[PDB]
Amino acid sequence: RTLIVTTILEEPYVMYRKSDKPLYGNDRFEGYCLDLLKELSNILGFLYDVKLVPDGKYGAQNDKGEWNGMVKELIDHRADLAVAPLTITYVREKVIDFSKPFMTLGISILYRKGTPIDSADDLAKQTKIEYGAVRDGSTMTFFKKSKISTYEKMWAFMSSRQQSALVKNSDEGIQRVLTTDYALLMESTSIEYVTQRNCNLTQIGGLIDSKGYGVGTPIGSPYRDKITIAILQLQEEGKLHMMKEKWWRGN
Amino acid sequence: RTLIVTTILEEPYVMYRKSDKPLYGNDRFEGYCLDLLKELSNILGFLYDVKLVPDGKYGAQNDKGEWNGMVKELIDHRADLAVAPLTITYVREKVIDFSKPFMTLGISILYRKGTPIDSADDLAKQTKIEYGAVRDGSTMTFFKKSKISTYEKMWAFMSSRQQSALVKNSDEGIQRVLTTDYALLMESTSIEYVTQRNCNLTQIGGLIDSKGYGVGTPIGSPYRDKITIAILQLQEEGKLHMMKEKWWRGN
Ligand SMILES: Cc1cn(C[C@H](N)C(=O)O)c(=O)n(Cc2c(C(=O)O)sc(Br)c2Br)c1=O
Ligand SMILES: Cc1cn(C[C@H](N)C(=O)O)c(=O)n(Cc2c(C(=O)O)sc(Br)c2Br)c1=O
Ligand SMILES: [Cl-]
The missing domain is CATH 3.40.190.10 (Periplasmic binding protein-like II)
Known part of the structure; x- marks a missing residue:
């Protein structure tokens, strides 16, 4: 066989x-x-x-x-x-x-180096930094289903504030982080791959799920x-x- | 049944x-x-x-x-x-x-806060900070079998420098980190449990194995x-x- x-x-x-x-x-x-x-x-x-x-x-x-x-x-x-x-x-x-x-x-955060931001909690309780995920992807589907306090409030910022939050694909999301004050939520494997190649970017916090x-x-x-x-x-x-x-x- | x-x-x-x-x-x-x-x-x-x-x-x-x-x-x-x-x-x-x-x-490092040490590589290439694991435990058994460059050199510091390196149990290892300039290698789950309870202590680096x-x-x-x-x-x-x-x- x-x-x-x-x-x-x-x-x-x-x-x-x-x-x-x-x-x-x-x-x-x-x-x-x-x-x-x-x-x-x-x-x-x-x-x-x-x-x-x-x-x-x-x-x-x-x-x-x-x-x-x-x-x-x-x-x-x-x-x-x-x-x-x-x-x-x-x-x-x-x-x-x-x-x-x-x-x-796990889900984690892609963002710039040199910022007081150290977790999803830091993004959840502020307005200045825009954050989201890829549309209809794994990370979005997680936030939509979640019943955990902090991730429910984060989904509100992604769903009700739909325009300047979600992206089409990986490529556009990383583009948003570099060019604008934006944080991308996606699978940590992808994040590590990006940070190895883009020295201005870092992972923020630990893993959101497992x-x-x-x-x-x-x-x-x-x-x-x-x-x-x-x-x-x-x-x-x-x-x-x-x-x-x-x-x-x-x- | x-x-x-x-x-x-x-x-x-x-x-x-x-x-x-x-x-x-x-x-x-x-x-x-x-x-x-x-x-x-x-x-x-x-x-x-x-x-x-x-x-x-x-x-x-x-x-x-x-x-x-x-x-x-x-x-x-x-x-x-x-x-x-x-x-x-x-x-x-x-x-x-x-x-x-x-x-x-995974295996990780338990050490004090406020130190340039950020990985196992930092401990491997220096002499000043003593480091080891619990005798005949999982973490020791890993280092003994390892053929990865940096962890082989670390095992030498644990085996040939046997006296001031290995400990009897979890309790003694944590005692060594607090009282002396010592870093303990053990399962990351145990490390998180300790750092939540001892605010002078932190995890160093990521996971050594998985x-x-x-x-x-x-x-x-x-x-x-x-x-x-x-x-x-x-x-x-x-x-x-x-x-x-x-x-x-x-x-
Ligand atoms: C390697 C990899 C696989 N997958 C697919 C997923 N693991 C699955 O099994 O469906 C992902 O969703 N991601 C992250 C990801 C997204 C996300 O994290 O939301 S959106 C898109 Br398009 C991707 Br490609 C990966 O990085
Ligand atoms: C919860 C837990 C279980 N085990 C047992 C191990 N997971 C196994 O399946 O043998 C451990 O070795 N460790 C770490 C550990 C050691 C180590 O990491 O070397 S030595 C000893 Br005594 C322990 Br209790 C754990 O923290
Ligand atoms: Cl199975």
Whole structure:
């Protein structure tokens, strides 16, 4: 069984290699998730074929119980594994299985260096600094559902003050932080990637929530627990650290 | 089936309640893990009986493949669940199963406030500040096995300079940080608990490794995945955050 692996283009997890050399199949790609997949394939001993998710989506539900993205590929048995920065969530565990996480993270704050601001509490109780997230993304969906005191007030500043708060994508959000007095809320992994590359920018405070990226499989897959074991081995032998360093470290 | 739950006395996860009131069975205990177990028991719908691990150990192997502690209780089918700050590790996954983690953590540094020291790199390349860990603990075992450049040099300062480096327990280590110019390396969860209560002390740098506490079960237990689902629900509805706050927050 050559395993079909669904994944998604996302810097620095999965990228097309910057090359016009004759590269075919898996060799067309590079990134943290390609390195991970190679290690997994060497520990477990499997052949694999990387296929980019056709709709370019992670995986969400509609009002009819219909899934899209990598999650749908798994449900439909069109992929054996999803090796991607795919968050392990309650709703997704209803329909697919996940390895234990290979990376753990949380929502955090992207902002400028040299400011008294040290937490989400500092942004919540002031008006001068504008703050928000990407529209219809994971971080927005968190703030919308939240019932925690401080994050409810923050969502009001994002929803009722809708205009100068939310952004279209990652690129525009970072643009807003640099050019204007703006703070972006997004997944801490993305924030670390940015701060390594933009020395005027820093993470503010700790993690607002807690979650992990795991390898997705169809429910009952005999690979899930084996992948957990491989992940634990890679963590303990310092290989996940080095793989993270390879892709995240800047100039 | 009234589930037998193995656990271990460890502040603030599991403690005897400070009361002479007539309290029996599970009611004798309090702590983060008791609160967690109650939530799990309400989501899954099980009855349970908390039993402290007789040997008071987490679970390690000897040179014959023989286990002790909570891990042994699970292997022997004398407990259905281990609900404790029990780290999910490669070696333990050989012999028991684990839910996905309810708490994630890493090795970090406990030291005084107001010092140029900002990482493990700062401690590694200097002699003036003494640093170590608890003898034969998780953090020591990490440094001993490590092949990462900076942590190998740090282990030399702990092993070859054995006398004024390692400590007997948590209590003595914190005592060393306060009284002498000493930095303690230990699990970040423990560090946060201490810094909330000792305003002269702070965490230094980020996390040196990455790992999680999970609920242990015997291999094949039908409760493992259900517990993962309950944990994800608790995380997403902010309950793990509030439970952490309940037990960790200081004066
Ligand atoms: C690597 C990565 C993956 N994902 C997808 C998410 N983990 C999922 O599984 O849906 C994200 O939402 N983020 C953060 C993010 C957003 C956010 O944090 O709100 S909005 C967008 Br577009 C992104 Br790409 C990531 O950085
Ligand atoms: C809550 C908790 C549990 N454990 C046990 C460990 N998680 C395991 O599963 O063995 C720890 O080692 N630590 C840190 C620790 C040590 C360390 O970090 O080296 S040494 C000792 Br005695 C402890 Br109690 C914890 O803080
Ligand atoms: Cl699992």
